[PDB]
Amino acid sequence: GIFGAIAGFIENGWEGMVDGWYGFRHQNSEGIGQAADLKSTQAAINQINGKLNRLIGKTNEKFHQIEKEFSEVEGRIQDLEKYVEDTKIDLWSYNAELLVALENQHTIDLTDSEMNKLFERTKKQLRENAEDMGNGCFKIYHKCDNACIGSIRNGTYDHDVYRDEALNNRFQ
Amino acid sequence: GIFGAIAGFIENGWEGMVDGWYGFRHQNSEGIGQAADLKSTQAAINQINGKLNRLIGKTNEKFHQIEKEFSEVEGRIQDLEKYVEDTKIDLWSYNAELLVALENQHTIDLTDSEMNKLFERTKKQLRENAEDMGNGCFKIYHKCDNACIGSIRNGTYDHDVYRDEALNNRF
Amino acid sequence: GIFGAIAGFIENGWEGMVDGWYGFRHQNSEGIGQAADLKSTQAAINQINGKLNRLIGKTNEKFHQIEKEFSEVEGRIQDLEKYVEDTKIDLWSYNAELLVALENQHTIDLTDSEMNKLFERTKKQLRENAEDMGNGCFKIYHKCDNACIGSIRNGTYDHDVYRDEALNNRFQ
Amino acid sequence: NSTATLCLGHHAVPNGTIVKTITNDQIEVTNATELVQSSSTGGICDSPHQILDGENCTLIDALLGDPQCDGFQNKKWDLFVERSKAYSNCYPYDVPDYASLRSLVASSGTLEFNNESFNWTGVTQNGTSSACKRRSNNSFFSRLNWLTHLKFKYPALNVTMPNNEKFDKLYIWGVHHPGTDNDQISLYAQASGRITVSTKRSQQTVIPNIGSRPRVRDIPSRISIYWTIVKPGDILLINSTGNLIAPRGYFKIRSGKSSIMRSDAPIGKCNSECITPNGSIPNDKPFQNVNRITYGACPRYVKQNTLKLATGMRNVPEK
Amino acid sequence: NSTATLCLGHHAVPNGTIVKTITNDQIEVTNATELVQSSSTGGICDSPHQILDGENCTLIDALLGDPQCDGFQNKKWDLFVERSKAYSNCYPYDVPDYASLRSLVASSGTLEFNNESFNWTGVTQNGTSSACKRRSNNSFFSRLNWLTHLKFKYPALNVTMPNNEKFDKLYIWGVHHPGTDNDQISLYAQASGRITVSTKRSQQTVIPNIGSRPRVRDIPSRISIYWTIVKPGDILLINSTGNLIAPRGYFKIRSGKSSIMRSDAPIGKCNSECITPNGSIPNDKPFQNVNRITYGACPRYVKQNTLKLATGMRNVPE
Amino acid sequence: STATLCLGHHAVPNGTIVKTITNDQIEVTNATELVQSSSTGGICDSPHQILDGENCTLIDALLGDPQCDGFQNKKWDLFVERSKAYSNCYPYDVPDYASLRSLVASSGTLEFNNESFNWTGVTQNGTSSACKRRSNNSFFSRLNWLTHLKFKYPALNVTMPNNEKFDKLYIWGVHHPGTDNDQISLYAQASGRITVSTKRSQQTVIPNIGSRPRVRDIPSRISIYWTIVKPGDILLINSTGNLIAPRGYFKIRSGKSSIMRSDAPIGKCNSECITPNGSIPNDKPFQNVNRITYGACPRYVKQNTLKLATGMRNVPEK
Ligand SMILES: *[C@@H]1O[C@H](CO)[C@@H](O[C@@H]2O[C@H](CO)[C@@H](O[C@@H]3O[C@H](CO[C@H]4O[C@H](CO)[C@@H](O)[C@H](O)[C@@H]4O)[C@@H](O)[C@H](O[C@H]4O[C@H](CO)[C@@H](O)[C@H](O)[C@@H]4O)[C@@H]3O)[C@H](O)[C@H]2NC(C)=O)[C@H](O)[C@H]1NC(C)=O
Ligand SMILES: *[C@@H]1O[C@H](CO)[C@@H](O[C@@H]2O[C@H](CO)[C@@H](O[C@@H]3O[C@H](CO[C@H]4O[C@H](CO)[C@@H](O)[C@H](O)[C@@H]4O)[C@@H](O)[C@H](O[C@H]4O[C@H](CO)[C@@H](O)[C@H](O)[C@@H]4O)[C@@H]3O)[C@H](O)[C@H]2NC(C)=O)[C@H](O)[C@H]1NC(C)=O
Ligand SMILES: *[C@@H]1O[C@H](CO)[C@@H](O[C@@H]2O[C@H](CO)[C@@H](O[C@@H]3O[C@H](CO[C@H]4O[C@H](CO)[C@@H](O)[C@H](O)[C@@H]4O)[C@@H](O)[C@H](O[C@H]4O[C@H](CO)[C@@H](O)[C@H](O)[C@@H]4O)[C@@H]3O)[C@H](O)[C@H]2NC(C)=O)[C@H](O)[C@H]1NC(C)=O
Ligand SMILES: *[C@@H]1O[C@H](CO)[C@@H](O[C@@H]2O[C@H](CO)[C@@H](O[C@@H]3O[C@H](CO[C@H]4O[C@H](CO)[C@@H](O)[C@H](O)[C@@H]4O)[C@@H](O)[C@H](O[C@H]4O[C@H](CO)[C@@H](O)[C@H](O)[C@@H]4O)[C@@H]3O)[C@H](O)[C@H]2NC(C)=O)[C@H](O)[C@H]1NC(C)=O
Ligand SMILES: *[C@@H]1O[C@H](CO)[C@@H](O[C@@H]2O[C@H](CO)[C@@H](O[C@@H]3O[C@H](CO[C@H]4O[C@H](CO)[C@@H](O)[C@H](O)[C@@H]4O)[C@@H](O)[C@H](O[C@H]4O[C@H](CO)[C@@H](O)[C@H](O)[C@@H]4O)[C@@H]3O)[C@H](O)[C@H]2NC(C)=O)[C@H](O)[C@H]1NC(C)=O
Ligand SMILES: *[C@@H]1O[C@H](CO)[C@@H](O[C@@H]2O[C@H](CO)[C@@H](O[C@@H]3O[C@H](CO[C@H]4O[C@H](CO)[C@@H](O)[C@H](O)[C@@H]4O)[C@@H](O)[C@H](O[C@H]4O[C@H](CO)[C@@H](O)[C@H](O)[C@@H]4O)[C@@H]3O)[C@H](O)[C@H]2NC(C)=O)[C@H](O)[C@H]1NC(C)=O
Ligand SMILES: *[C@@H]1O[C@H](CO)[C@@H](O[C@@H]2O[C@H](CO)[C@@H](O[C@@H]3O[C@H](CO)[C@@H](O)[C@H](O[C@H]4O[C@H](CO)[C@@H](O)[C@H](O)[C@@H]4O)[C@@H]3O)[C@H](O)[C@H]2NC(C)=O)[C@H](O)[C@H]1NC(C)=O
Ligand SMILES: *[C@@H]1O[C@H](CO)[C@@H](O[C@@H]2O[C@H](CO)[C@@H](O[C@@H]3O[C@H](CO)[C@@H](O)[C@H](O)[C@@H]3O)[C@H](O)[C@H]2NC(C)=O)[C@H](O)[C@H]1NC(C)=O
Ligand SMILES: *[C@@H]1O[C@H](CO)[C@@H](O[C@@H]2O[C@H](CO)[C@@H](O)[C@H](O)[C@H]2NC(C)=O)[C@H](O)[C@H]1NC(C)=O
Ligand SMILES: *[C@@H]1O[C@H](CO)[C@@H](O)[C@H](O)[C@H]1NC(C)=O
Ligand SMILES: *[C@@H]1O[C@H](CO)[C@@H](O)[C@H](O)[C@H]1NC(C)=O
Ligand SMILES: *[C@@H]1O[C@H](CO)[C@@H](O)[C@H](O)[C@H]1NC(C)=O
Ligand SMILES: *[C@@H]1O[C@H](CO)[C@@H](O)[C@H](O)[C@H]1NC(C)=O
Ligand SMILES: *[C@@H]1O[C@H](CO)[C@@H](O)[C@H](O)[C@H]1NC(C)=O
Ligand SMILES: *[C@@H]1O[C@H](CO)[C@@H](O)[C@H](O)[C@H]1NC(C)=O
């Protein structure tokens, strides 16, 4: 949410994209299609996986401890034992609550960041051959078939090839 | 500070802005004015209000505890009771200090984020009819009166209406 | 890593930059050279320095505590003493691991942020006299001597001076 | 061929407040709020917690039945307040494990005393002393029965008392330690009398120690106080040949939110869930710097005097 | 045509999950995982920790040698499970500092008892009572020797037993408190008595108190249980004139992972490092909400019922 | 007619690996250690006043062992107890030994103002073969062994008020003779009750005549107790025999003083942090040397190393 991409200019999450987390939707003379960017998709997954590996499976081993349940009624010693455990449980619960909130806040932003980074990479790749419409879509000002649209996803898009046509359409 | 807008390229806070947290100052033919963007203002406020809901209140209810003040000297049993409470106080003191430092860092960044998000929304809305002067101000290259500037703040700005004029001025 | 600049579009760290942390590499008729922006360097250094001052030298003073080593076997009271110290050590150990992980995550991003801030400042300074090549490099479309390259670093670059020449070269 | 200008900006305050961050130790923000409560109203509020002001009486003094503490008989509380001015005006007594008895009674939160009928045959009941004076006459602890010799004879007492209720009964008893051997003979007709208060689960034996102690209220003798808890279905057996301060019944013991606090603050009339010895404090802020001792829903005590949390952006003033 | 449109977007799920963040208390994400373990299998696993079910025998009852606890002799464990159904069918006993003795025995993790030969000359050994009955005959605690008079005489006892091993020896002894003074004479022929179990470092003196207690199993008398630990190179001295419940040897004290747990959960066949009184629970999640009492590789107990960690982006459905 | 300007960051040939939230191993340009895991090996004499007990435990110096006479009326900030310590006096047992040791250590002084008690009718300055001073029979310096005078031991009722503004700590004892003949030969009475009483506290001890395992050829024992009289209170010692009388009071204070058990050398340096393993620096926030600490010390953690990134990510040229 810090970058304003997941809930920002992109106001729709494509429920039909099942092959990845981020991707491309194109409209060209040859029709409409959908694709996925695996680099950005694996980008979010690897970061989130690192948070999980740091938490899941890392349990402590404690064998002999103090009494934590008392049947009879005692004085000072029983009160101290109850206070120690109660303080310990309260402290760990705060650590759990703060950690869950922080990680989820970071998870939102890093997933938001990865979407924005994909958007910025595409914009720089298109150079002056397209314009940002403001809703997460680029209006390419040249005839792009299903080949050069794949070139933009492939990173093999040379703006010089279509620059003369694009500039002519834009400023006329 | 991460986005570099609050103290970055816009290195000036408008003390005259009392109706909102972020806004526009329209310097145009038909005069100069100031307005405030309620969407970005309420966005940052709601996030900060959310932080307060998690901190203000939520206090523990503890009725009977151990003794924390002693008049005589007892020895081992008294030493453990003092050690337990002193350890607890130091640990909670660390959590209090760390939380304030972390939240305040997040408060600065999210307010910076909301300012930057408003700036970029304006740029895409204007399309190619204006240029970022670098100080957070857009030099609109067509005659925009106090109506179409309201349209920019309203989200009802159509760049094609002024595109032919704006591009010609830039040429 | 959130901004995607240190490991993003700029995927090459100049090992030759010894005078600073971030800087400029320029090409002109006069040759190729390297420079450093000390403002962006000191911005990142101060942030990291603040984290150290909050940690280094801020030690507590504790004089008399409970016994932590026991030779004989006593039972209930001894178990409580062992439990308290082990609980305290476990809680502080969790705080140490989280603090190191959290600060290091922020250190990457704030260093990433300052890189992005330097890049965005240069783009706005150049206005419409250059185009972003997408790899952290700007293609300036006018005759820039070793002087105006310094002007870009110093902030004394007037885009209006070269705008007519730059715009003509771009859109022709 | 004219132009227009649109500038975007944020608000700023003239002075603002300085807060602490991860990066910087001193940074200016537009607005902030305090998170550490370092002030108190000065008085304990009577609500919503049931306060019982001990005034001149410690909780043990009220339990035993000191004459000045007769106003606390069969009383309930959520937080018993012991005043530093409290004293004892009765027989000088010593309570082994005083803290534990004080702790469990405070946690129970009641001074209910259902009087019981023991079969005290052969011994003189309702003993009196000059140190314990009710009004202006010799008396003794109200909840304690000073059993003395009857007709120069103290036959062994072996009475029984079953616990027919579903709650545990708390019995407060004592042993008298005479200062002189004459007082030992003149009160119990024996040289030494063992006290064996036993149940089906626990047992307790006490030996009188005849000897002179530093005279308190001109009383060289001492009284040792012990307590026994009989569980539902358990029975109480008291075997003794003398020096026995017999109980007059049982105290009801419960479990709840009741506790005890040592404070000298006035009991005002207000609503504050958080109670500290320095006075009731608000429970709005997450942390406090008033006192580590708390009662009710209280902010967590920290060592910091102030911890300012920024509620707005960074402040960049115009001038 | 002459133009094209390229749109960038993210995925979304029809049914998202609500998680809590710093900014918002309820925000919807594509996917999430639970961090708090709140379910139990219902039974204690036999592995990888060596479990020992006491059934009707407490740890102290098994240590002393109650007739129903003879099956636990010289047995070791990693977690002794004490059942609430446990009872005692022997001489009534009271153990001062009962928790400490239970804790030290449980932590040691063994009930090894090496029989020793004491010089009980002049006194009658292997005393029995009607309350402690083994094989439908009067008996006593298996690890305790009830010393009574021999030929109506109870000579002063002064026995010695050195610790010639490299480990500490745990000695369990007791003192008999007769209910009537006649019973004191009928068993020890002396008025009252004193037992002083002393070593080169420790000293312990106990005075019998003859008096009637509420009779349990028709026994008005009581026995108080005490323990002594002699270190390598130390010697054990038992000075007594009567009322002595003598030990029959020493218990080996060890150091290990053993402990004690009170539960009424079944002992099944599975492999779970985490053991709680409610039953063995998985240790995959970092936190748990089953029981504060745990054993082994266990998640940390928290007061929270559920804690969902976002494992995806925000769910913004169309 | 064109120019190109490139922006970049620095990189080092050899980076450092640090741990982040997202990644377990990420390379950075520079990092610093946060856990101190090394020690100089010796305790610094400054800024904390160290007192080396050498062959004397704190109780031995308090009681007055002949080898501990050099510690008389000495103050400290951290008493260092050595494992090589031994005792050459009458065998003694101190109930709640940890509390008395802790109480003396926290006070931080062994100041002893001698008082004049009215021990009339009894012989004072009793000595034993075990306690040897200047190759002559002696006793604890702060304790008075009261024996019979002219085969008579009158009943003792002595008084001593606390007329000062500080609490007085009194160390006294009771003698447990090994043989009844030794009890008669020293005290002329069969047993002597000792009742050290104040206006609030009372303490009664009964001697137990019996043989104990001989230490330094002494079968008899003495039990050590302490009493604290508050300002305005009076001290009453009621006794008929077997009394190891005090010779005065110890001043009890409140301060930074404590006690540490270590065998580390005492060098010359300035280190606020002191551990049993030796003085360590307090620059890093955390340490891994010893859980026992004194002074301005880093907080003990289980982690061996924790590297904090002090630079950007190292992205070297391929
Ligand atoms: C072991 O040693 C201790 C300490 O010496 C003894 O304890 C003291 O014993 C003496 C002797 O019996 C006690 O002295 C008596 O004190 C009484 C105090 O009461 C008055 O004074 C106080 C203070 O002013 C007032 O608050 C109070 O209201 C009273 O007004 C005196 O009253 C006694 O006076 C005697 O003479 C007068 C005048 O003739 C008579 O009227 C009296 O009846 C009495 O005979 C007397 O002085 C002292 O109180 C004890 N305590 C203390 C703390 O000192 C033990 O007794 C001793 N043990 C043995 C077995 O001997
Ligand atoms: C717990 O409560 C029980 C009662 O329920 C008490 O029991 C009494 O205990 C005393 C002391 O042990 C016993 O007294 C002894 O009696 C002996 C004779 O008893 C017989 O004869 C009498 C009639 O003369 C009958 O009533 C009785 O039933 C017997 O048939 C005496 O010979 C003893 O003398 C010894 O003590 C005296 C001092 O008391 C000395 O001078 C002597 O030299 C000798 O040493 C003694 O007097 C009494 O018999 C018991 N009665 C009952 C009914 O049990 C417990 O004492 C009591 N214990 C405690 C700790 O409180
Ligand atoms: C929502 O978030 C949760 C967070 O946990 C994700 O949960 C994981 O979901 C995947 C889905 O495929 C599970 O993957 C399967 O793991 C099996 C082994 O499990 C162990 O190892 C994994 C790590 O590899 C641990 O996470 C897990 O706890 C176990 O320790 C594999 O054997 C599976 O293999 C698949 O392919 C092989 C080859 O075809 C087949 O033979 C198998 O049958 C199977 O089809 C598979 O990889 C993973 O275990 C889940 N982890 C946890 C901790 O629950 C969710 O995926 C995510 N999204 C949704 C929609 O729920
Ligand atoms: C101090 O005061 C207590 C008060 O309880 C006395 O304790 C009681 O002492 C008597 C006498 O020893 C005990 O009587 C015994 O009761 C046993 C339990 O009986 C149950 O069943 C009957 C009905 O059949 C019920 O009325 C009763 O309440 C019980 O539910 C009996 O089994 C005993 O029988 C004896 O005689 C038979 C004869 O055949 C023998 O076979 C038995 O083995 C046994 O010897 C006996 O009648 C009574 O139980 C005690 N109560 C408690 C609570 O302890 C103390 O005795 C007294 N102190 C002194 C010194 O006397
Ligand atoms: C803390 O406690 C330890 C152990 O009790 C003490 O160490 C002993 O101290 C005594 C002196 O108090 C030493 O006695 C000396 O022995 C020297 C020979 O040492 C060798 O032989 C002995 C016996 O086998 C071994 O223990 C030892 O390790 C050596 O192998 C003699 O040379 C000494 O007398 C001669 O030398 C001195 C110095 O020149 C002269 O002044 C004398 O007049 C004489 O000529 C002396 O007899 C003993 O050796 C020490 N070790 C042991 C193991 O007992 C510490 O001293 C004590 N701490 C303090 C501060 O005193
Ligand atoms: C605390 O300190 C006080 C200080 O006084 C001690 O008090 C003395 O204690 C002893 C021992 O208990 C008492 O001695 C006993 O005195 C009895 C009465 O004697 C007085 O009265 C007679 C006339 O009736 C006079 O002739 C005599 O001189 C006294 O004035 C005697 O009857 C006792 O005799 C017993 O002991 C002897 C010797 O062993 C035997 O031969 C006898 O058979 C019999 O068993 C005995 O002599 C002394 O009287 C007490 N003094 C006072 C003033 O009370 C406390 O004892 C002490 N307590 C503790 C716990 O420390
Ligand atoms: C209760 O039992 C204990 C343990 O058995 C017992 O302690 C032993 O007492 C004897 C005699 O008091 C001690 O033997 C002495 O040991 C020392 C040091 O080894 C020797 O110096 C002594 O020798 C002299 O005395 C002898 C007396 O007969 C002479 O024959 C000899 O020639 C020497 O002059 C003597 O052997 C023995 O060391 C202790 N053992 C311990 C403490 O472990 C205690 O005495 C018994 N209780 C009673 C009241 O007897
Ligand atoms: C709690 O205890 C205190 C202290 O004992 C009680 O204080 C009362 O204080 C007044 C002060 O004026 C005493 O009155 C005065 O008494 C003297 C006695 O000589 C007389 O000369 C004066 O003219 C005046 O009357 C009063 O006696 C005293 N009461 C008692 C019982 O000591 C207080 O009353 C106790 N109760 C409460 C609820 O505070
Ligand atoms: C410990 O045992 C010793 C040795 O039997 C006891 O001391 C003897 O006791 C008898 C009986 O009273 C006397 O006849 C002897 O004179 C005593 N001394 C010796 C050297 O034998 C001692 O009483 C016992 N102590 C206890 C508490 O039982
Ligand atoms: C797209 O990239 C792949 C390699 O990932 C390459 O084989 C293919 O030829 C590319 N398609 C183009 C350049 O049209
Ligand atoms: C930029 O500043 C440096 C600072 O020394 C100076 O040497 C250089 O000439 C400046 N370049 C300009 C003003 O173009
Ligand atoms: C500052 O923020 C607090 C908490 O959000 C708010 O209650 C208060 O009205 C604000 N005051 C100012 C002057 O901004
Ligand atoms: C001691 O003898 C008993 C009786 O047979 C037996 O249960 C126990 O295992 C024996 N101890 C050893 C070490 O064999
Ligand atoms: C009492 O004498 C001892 C032994 O010399 C000494 O340590 C102490 O200072 C003396 N007390 C004084 C002089 O007040
Ligand atoms: C010491 O006690 C005796 C006992 O008779 C007494 O005479 C003497 O006066 C006392 N000492 C002092 C200094 O009063």
Author numbering:
A (entry chain c), C (entry chain a): 330 to 501
B (entry chain b): 330 to 500
D (entry chain B): 8 to 326
E (entry chain C): 8 to 325
F (entry chain A): 9 to 326
Manuscript excerpt for this entry:
Neutralizing antibodies target the hemagglutinin (HA), a trimeric protein containing “stem” (also known as the “stalk”) and “head” domains in each protomer. The head domain includes the Receptor Binding Site (RBS), making this domain the primary target of neutralizing antibodies by blocking virus attachment to host cells. The stem domain contains the fusion peptide, which is targeted by a smaller subset of neutralizing antibodies that prevent membrane fusion. Other designs, such as centralized conserved and computationally optimized broadly reactive antigen (COBRA) HA proteins, retain the subtype-specific structural architecture in both domains while seeking to accentuate the conserved features common to circulating strains.
Through structural comparisons with other HA proteins, including novel crystal structures of COBRA HAs TJ2 and J4, we identified the residues primarily responsible for the variable binding patterns observed by biolayer interferometry. To investigate the molecular factors that may improve or worsen the recognition of HA by these antibodies, we performed structural comparisons of the NG2-Fab cryo-EM structures with representative HA proteins from the BLI assay panel. This included newly solved crystal structures of TJ2 and J4 as representative strong binders, as well as a previously solved structure of the A/Port Chalmers/1/1973 HA and an AlphaFold3 prediction of the A/Tasmania/503/2020 HA to represent no binding and weak binding, respectively. In TJ2, the presence of an asparagine at residue 145 rather than a serine creates the potential for a new hydrogen bond with R73 by virtue of the shorter intermolecular distance. This feature is present in all the strains in the assay panel from 2005 to 2012, which correlates well with the most effective time period for this antibody. The COBRA HA J4, while lacking this same feature, shows some evidence in the electron density map of an N-linked glycan at residue 144. Interestingly, although the same glycan is not definitively observed in the COBRA HA TJ2 electron density map, the sequence of TJ2 possesses a canonical NXS motif in this same region that would have similar potential. Even the difference in the absence or presence of an additional hydroxyl group, as seen with F159 in COBRA HA TJ2 versus Y159 in COBRA HA J4, is enough to alter the kinetics in binding via a faster dissociation rate. In COBRA HA TJ2, the lower hydrophobicity of S193 and loss of a hydrogen bond via A198 are partially mitigated by the retention of I192.
